[PDB]
Amino acid sequence: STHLADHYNQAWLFAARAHRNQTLSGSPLPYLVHLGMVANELLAADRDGAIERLGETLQIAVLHDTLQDTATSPEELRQQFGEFVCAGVQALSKRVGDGPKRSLDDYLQALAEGPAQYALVKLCDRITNLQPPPQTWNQDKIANYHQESQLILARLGHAHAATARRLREKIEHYRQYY
């Protein structure tokens, strides 16, 4: 049916519109910079362990922030991308629009017990977020982000062996910033 690049493009154009008013933290660069790196991580992960429903899981990597940070409705995602993608973005949303924000334990438990592909997108998200910390973070903020990353590894590393290995290496590398 649908080429992997056509799945990407549909999600990518959607996300570029949805996130058009959003930048990276402390940087004037488009938020799209983050989503590019998450999606690339996910497609690279397939090379080191094939992913069931790779097209839709790539789309979930592109769209994973739409319900939290944009004017995007769950109904829009379900109509345009299907249930599995909608439920992927919901699983990855700590908070949907101005609804209640879920605790990390609740968030990680639901991802651990749910479809492994959703958990795998979270590993790709944290790997992306273990680039060098923003220049305005103190030693304490860095240290806390490092410890939170270790919980994400412990709770979700089951999802994909190679990507868990890569997240551990990023966690070990990030130790140098504090």
Residue ranges of the binding site for Mn(2+): 34, 64-65, 125
Contact partner at residue 125 from a second copy, Mn ion, none, CB < 5 to 8 Å by partner kind: Mn ion
The 92-131 site mask, x for binding a second copy (CB under 8 A), equals -----------------------------------xx--x
* 44 lies in the binding site for a second copy (CB under 8 A): yes
* Partners of residue 30 on adjacent β-strands: 23
- On the CB side of 174, how many CA atoms lie within 13 Å of its CA? 26
Which residue, 79 or 141, is less far from Mn ion as judged by CB?
Answer: 141
Which residues on adjacent β-strands are paired with residue 139?
none
- Nearest residue to Mn ion by CB is 125
Q: Give the residue, chosen from 1, 2, 3, 100, that forms a contact with a second copy under the rule CB under 8 A.
A: 3
Count of residues in the chain: 178
Say which entry of Mn ion, a second copy, none residue 47 contacts (CB below 5 to 8 A, set by partner kind): a second copy
When asked if residue 5 is in the footprint of a second copy (CB under 8 A), the reply is: yes
Give the residue numbers of the binding site.
34, 64-65, 125
The one segment of 13-21, 75-83, 112-120, 152-160 that binds a second copy by CB under 8 A: 13-21
What are the distances in angstroms from CA 132 to CA 127, 144, 165? 11, 14, 19
- Cβ-proximal residues to 83 (8 Å cutoff; 6+ apart), any chain: none
161 touches which of Mn ion, a second copy, none (CB within 5 to 8 A by kind)? none
The option from a second copy, Mn ion, none interacting with 16 (CB < 5 to 8 A, set by class) reads: a second copy
Q: Does 4 bind a second copy (CB under 8 A)?
A: yes
- The span from the CA of 69 to the CA of 54, in Å, is 24
Among 33, 71, 154, 161, binds a second copy (CB under 8 A): 33
List 126's β-bridge partners, or say none.
none
Evaluate whether 156 touches 122 at the Cβ level (below 8 Å). yes
> Is residue 177 packed enough to be buried (19+ CB in 10 Å), middle (13-18) or exposed (0-12)?
middle
